[PDB]
Amino acid sequence: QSKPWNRYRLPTTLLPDSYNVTLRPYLTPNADGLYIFKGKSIVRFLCQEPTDVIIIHSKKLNYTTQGHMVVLRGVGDSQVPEIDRTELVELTEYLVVHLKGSLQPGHMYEMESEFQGELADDLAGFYRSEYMEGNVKKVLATTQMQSTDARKSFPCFDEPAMKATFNITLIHPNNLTALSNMPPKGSSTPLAEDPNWSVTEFETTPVMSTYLLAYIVSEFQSVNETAQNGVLIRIWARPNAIAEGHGMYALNVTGPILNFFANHYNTSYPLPKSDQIALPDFNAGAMENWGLVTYRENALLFDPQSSSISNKERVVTVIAHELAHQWFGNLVTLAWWNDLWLNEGFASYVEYLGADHAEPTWNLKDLIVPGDVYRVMAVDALASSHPLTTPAEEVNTPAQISEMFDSISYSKGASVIRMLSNFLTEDLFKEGLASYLHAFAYQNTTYLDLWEHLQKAVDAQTSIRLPDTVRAIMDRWTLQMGFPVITVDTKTGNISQKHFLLDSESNVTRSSAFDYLWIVPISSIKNGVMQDHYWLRDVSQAQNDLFKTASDDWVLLNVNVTGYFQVNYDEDNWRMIQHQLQTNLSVIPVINRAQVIYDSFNLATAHMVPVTLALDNTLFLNGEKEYMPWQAALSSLSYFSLMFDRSEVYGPMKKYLRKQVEPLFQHFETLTKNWTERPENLMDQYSEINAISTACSNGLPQCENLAKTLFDQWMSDPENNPIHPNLRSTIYCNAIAQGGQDQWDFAWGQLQQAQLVNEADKLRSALACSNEVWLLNRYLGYTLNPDLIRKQDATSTINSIASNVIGQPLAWDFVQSNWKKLFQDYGGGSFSFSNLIQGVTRRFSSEFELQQLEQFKKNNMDVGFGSGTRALEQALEKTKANIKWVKENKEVVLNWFIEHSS
Ligand SMILES: *[C@@H]1O[C@H](CO)[C@@H](O[C@@H]2O[C@H](CO)[C@@H](O[C@@H]3O[C@H](CO)[C@@H](O)[C@H](O)[C@H]3NC(C)=O)[C@H](O)[C@H]2NC(C)=O)[C@H](O)[C@H]1NC(C)=O
Ligand SMILES: *[C@@H]1O[C@H](CO)[C@@H](O[C@@H]2O[C@H](CO)[C@@H](O[C@@H]3O[C@H](CO)[C@@H](O)[C@H](O)[C@H]3NC(C)=O)[C@H](O)[C@H]2NC(C)=O)[C@H](O)[C@H]1NC(C)=O
Ligand SMILES: *[C@@H]1O[C@H](CO)[C@@H](O[C@@H]2O[C@H](CO)[C@@H](O[C@@H]3O[C@H](CO)[C@@H](O)[C@H](O)[C@H]3NC(C)=O)[C@H](O)[C@H]2NC(C)=O)[C@H](O)[C@H]1NC(C)=O
Ligand SMILES: *[C@@H]1O[C@H](CO)[C@@H](O[C@@H]2O[C@H](CO)[C@@H](O)[C@H](O)[C@H]2NC(C)=O)[C@H](O)[C@H]1NC(C)=O
Ligand SMILES: *[C@@H]1O[C@H](CO)[C@@H](O[C@@H]2O[C@H](CO)[C@@H](O)[C@H](O)[C@H]2NC(C)=O)[C@H](O)[C@H]1NC(C)=O
Ligand SMILES: *[C@@H]1O[C@H](CO)[C@@H](O[C@@H]2O[C@H](CO)[C@@H](O)[C@H](O)[C@H]2NC(C)=O)[C@H](O)[C@H]1NC(C)=O
Ligand SMILES: *[C@@H]1O[C@H](CO)[C@@H](O[C@@H]2O[C@H](CO)[C@@H](O)[C@H](O)[C@H]2NC(C)=O)[C@H](O)[C@H]1NC(C)=O
Ligand SMILES: *[C@@H]1O[C@H](CO)[C@@H](O[C@@H]2O[C@H](CO)[C@@H](O)[C@H](O)[C@H]2NC(C)=O)[C@H](O)[C@H]1NC(C)=O
Ligand SMILES: *[C@@H]1O[C@H](CO)[C@@H](O[C@@H]2O[C@H](CO)[C@@H](O)[C@H](O)[C@H]2NC(C)=O)[C@H](O)[C@H]1NC(C)=O
Ligand SMILES: *[C@@H]1O[C@H](CO)[C@@H](O)[C@H](O)[C@H]1NC(C)=O
Ligand SMILES: *[C@@H]1O[C@H](CO)[C@@H](O)[C@H](O)[C@H]1NC(C)=O
Ligand SMILES: [Zn+2]
């Protein structure tokens, strides 16, 4: 038999009841420059099955406990066995307490320890974060337990189902504020041994998972609101950020969001208070710690004076996402990491619902389609994809756990759950969801538990009828990878499904229990009129008159793309759809106007329609005012720009896009009153942003003029920037492009003195738009100077230069030549050679450029490629694919653009 301390999963012989944890960060280094934290903990646990060994998680902790690493006591009048020895097993991250006798079933024990670890700047466990206020480097102490890092802060049974209550105490400098999951018990008191420190105890948590604990010591201040029901709401940030009002939007939306979810979940917010904190350079983005959610600054803070509308959208949705978890994930927790998709998928879906409550005019629910659905289909339409579900017994190590957090989990998770809610109807979905939350509150679940509760709700009504059980249906979408293309022959109404792969030559080797057949919910509209709903059963082919048309009619499947699939038609039907969009576009829902474009380009890639059919699907856009369909086109064509923008194809492409976008440009010119005032709602602001971007980058003289006027204006009065934050990135870029070193030097100055990251980002990126070789090269010369360009921004800046058709050869030469600086930057901070390689080689699409990539690889003898080693092979393989796609497409595409550019 194997020794349990060499297994990655904990025994089930002992379960925790409750913990006391006292942590003390030392925010002053020890002289060799080491930061530490000290801790003391007691865990009370119950013996379920007799055992002579206590196995608990511990990671990078030194123990200073008197005697062995722990002291062990009986609770009440329980006797305790003597300890034989305590040992640390690093691989499985265990503290192992060998006893001289056995613990007894039904008895409770208390295990006490004293310990310390590094308070490292490593964003893991209890860690430090350094940042600037004026001339002073500030250091705060914060946490990130997700997923398996609670054990790095104190010894604990560190699996999500082993829930317990926690009594947290922080010992901290007396002028700093201490925060945790729960409110403080009362006022802090001086530490007797050194009154320069204070002691803050927090109220007992509810029964909860280790990965959701948080505790923070900082100088941060807050804005506050007390909801009607007494729930205290705070936004925490740097003193200067709070003073500038940058927390106000977050504060504005939080209350409405929490209220939405309490109703949505039919369950009261389970905590006395809600803290949200903006952390500078929090690389994890956001973390849903129960009652103390952490965010990176740019995710939580908003500056009205400098920030675009998309910045506002990012804030409200990120908040909605993390707050969703305060019920789904935190109150009811998935028993194991193999089910992470359900948790993350669920939040990734309802983030739109919660945000929609806060901003009900913005139509935010739509954004899941571009943002998650089409995003994840790009990777789920590969042979190298994977099922949402993973057997629990395959997910053991901290590395395997981390692999759970990917695109499939979040975005497909969101997509399939949204499909589910839609085919059940939302009211039914909510009833099952409430039932599930009430049944399992403060406990753990698998996805089968959710299915079971949804089934209960289905079985309790008569109106919604399904072709099979909730499980059986969802099994098709969760146990196998990928998704079907549904193809309709409208002459007969024959309808088929096959596993959709972008690469029509690809070999799938992952087998499916279902032979890649799905049970598919199919909505459809015929001549602008909703039809009866239809289910494709697990068959390759079927027939229904729902999908059979006359010659003047059209049909269109998957209304609003609720279903996780793409749709192809016979050419006649495609043409009727096209005719419709050409003559009265408003007959077809805006999301579907986008879909037509998204799907057909994917179908063209897969060789299932000709590419010209996809391009025909953009012809209607000259009368399209709305954001989404235009965004579908821009996303689908960016590859065409990337392949062709150095070729004869490019002039007719530009000309075609100029023709298409001119009327939209004109529309907004009037609507915005000569560009003085933005459109009202989000979608229209977005459409305007894209229209100006598209107009300018394609050389519409009117947009070019606008950019010069505004940038000249700004330059004549630097302190009063006349350019609305929504339009900044285009106007900066186009105007630098048009100009010389005057514009360039001016924007360089602004960059150097910018206080706000986002504005710095815009400037950095616009500077790459110059059409002077000498400026781009000089600029390249700065990117490795950490005085002029932050290191974490160097490869980004190089990529932006590479993106400039003129800066392509300059960047490539620069990367080649200074590659001999992996050995400055695999050592001194990561660097992401991987993203740099992809960026600078993205364009490569000929034999000659392939020969160059090869010849550059012949610098294998030493230096190698570091974290970009795999990227470089991807590059050579992507280039081969580009070579092949350009030979197949260049002629057909050139002539289509010539033909349609007037
Ligand atoms: C986990 O932390 C809890 C909070 O520190 C502990 O509970 C507290 O124990 C204290 C003493 O052990 C009690 O404080 C006072 O101490 C005096 C000492 O002279 C005692 O007489 C008193 O009982 C007590 N105060 C009063 C008003 O009587 C606290 O009563 C108590 N706090 C609580 C219960 O909220 C837990 O003991 C500790 N857990 C373990 C396993 O050690
Ligand atoms: C947890 O305990 C670890 C093992 O006891 C500590 O790791 C040791 O850190 C020492 C530095 O504190 C290093 O030893 C020497 O330190 C002296 C002065 O600090 C220096 O003169 C030497 O350069 C250094 N010796 C060497 C060979 O570098 C040890 O490197 C290191 N030992 C091991 C086995 O890793 C941790 O510091 C300690 N952590 C905490 C938070 O308490
Ligand atoms: C958090 O919510 C607050 C309350 O809803 C918002 O406060 C609103 O700020 C608006 C922008 O500053 C103000 O709108 C207009 O500002 C112009 C500029 O001077 C004035 O001419 C207008 O008179 C004024 N509004 C009106 C209706 O005349 C609002 O005054 C103000 N609304 C309220 C109710 O106080 C915050 O904007 C919001 N914070 C963020 C970051 O979104
Ligand atoms: C954490 O604090 C809580 C709340 O004070 C402690 O809960 C008490 O537990 C004791 C001993 O089990 C019971 O007698 C009390 O009735 C509990 N009080 C409440 C309000 O539940 C809990 O024991 C503490 N945890 C640890 C490990 O000491
Ligand atoms: C908390 O107290 C510490 C110690 O007095 C203050 O930290 C000093 O701040 C000054 C600037 O005012 C620096 O020049 C010192 O080097 C700091 N010392 C240390 C160890 O950081 C700190 O400013 C106080 N913070 C608050 C919010 O009151
Ligand atoms: C959970 O939902 C139930 C059902 O809507 C709520 O209870 C209903 O509340 C309405 C509101 O006036 C009453 O008229 C109904 O008679 C109630 N139905 C039942 C079965 O009691 C309940 O308020 C919700 N709970 C939470 C915490 O949101
Ligand atoms: C994981 O969650 C399950 C429920 O999904 C917990 O099992 C329940 O425990 C409660 C309260 O102690 C009992 O009332 C139920 O009868 C149990 N349901 C079961 C066993 O199916 C289980 O305790 C949780 N696991 C851990 C380690 O806490
Ligand atoms: C639509 O589907 C039907 C089958 O369900 C196809 O009709 C069959 O054609 C085969 C040709 O070998 C005949 O042997 C069968 O007897 C036909 N079944 C009938 C007529 O009911 C038809 O070809 C399909 N048409 C499409 C996909 O355009
Ligand atoms: C398709 O999505 C659109 C939104 O893009 C839905 O239109 C919404 O309809 C509801 C009910 O009338 C209204 O609350 C919203 O005002 C509508 N928004 C807009 C922008 O029109 C439409 O309901 C969806 N269609 C289907 C069949 O689900
Ligand atoms: C897939 O197997 C086929 C055999 O039909 C082979 O021709 C092809 O090269 C293989 N690999 C790819 C990526 O197409
Ligand atoms: C276009 O269709 C919409 C929705 O069916 C309708 O209300 C509108 O009258 C139509 N417009 C024209 C110009 O026919
Ligand atoms: Zn999440």
Curated annotation (Swiss-Prot):
Renumbered residue ranges of the record's region Metalloprotease: 3-901
Cofactor(s) for this UniProt protein: Zn(2+)
Subunit structure: Homodimer. Interacts with SLC6A19. (Microbial infection) Interacts with TGEV and PRCoV spike glycoprotein.
Membrane topology listed for this record: Single-pass type II membrane protein
Native organism taxonomy: Eukaryota, Metazoa, Chordata, Craniata, Vertebrata
Cystine bridges: C696-C703, C733-C769
Keywords for the protein's UniProt record, in alphabetical order: Aminopeptidase, Angiogenesis, Cell membrane, Developmental protein, Differentiation, Disulfide bond, Glycoprotein, Host cell receptor for virus entry, Host-virus interaction, Hydrolase, Membrane, Metal-binding, Metalloprotease, Protease, Receptor, Signal-anchor, Sulfation, Transmembrane, Transmembrane helix, Zinc
GO BP of this protein: angiogenesis; cell differentiation; peptide catabolic process; proteolysis
Modified sites of kind Sulfotyrosine: Y109
Organism: Sus scrofa
Binding site for Zn(2+): H321, H325, E344
GO cellular component assignments: cytoplasm; extracellular space; plasma membrane
Active site: E322
Enzyme class: hydrolase
Co-factor: note: Binds 1 zinc ion per subunit.
Sequence ranges on the Extracellular membrane side: 1-901
Known role: Broad specificity aminopeptidase which plays a role in the final digestion of peptides generated from hydrolysis of proteins by gastric and pancreatic proteases. Also involved in the processing of various peptides including peptide hormones, such as angiotensin III and IV, neuropeptides, and chemokines. May also be involved the cleavage of peptides bound to major histocompatibility complex class II molecules of antigen presenting cells. May have a role in angiogenesis and promote cholesterol crystallization.
E.C. no: 3.4.11.2
GO molecular function: alanyl aminopeptidase activity; metalloaminopeptidase activity; peptide binding; virus receptor activity; zinc ion binding
Membership in a protein family: Belongs to the peptidase M1 family.
Protein name: Aminopeptidase N
Subcellular location: Cell membrane
Site (described: Transition state stabilizer): Y410
Binding site for substrate: G285, A286, M287, E288, N289
Record PTM text: Sulfated. N- and O-glycosylated.
Reactions listed under catalytic activity: Release of an N-terminal amino acid, Xaa-|-Yaa- from a peptide, amide or arylamide. Xaa is preferably Ala, but may be most amino acids including Pro (slow action). When a terminal hydrophobic residue is followed by a prolyl residue, the two may be released as an intact Xaa-Pro dipeptide
Glycan-carrying positions: N20, N62, N167, N175, N196, N224, N252, N266, N444, N494, N507, N560, N584, N674
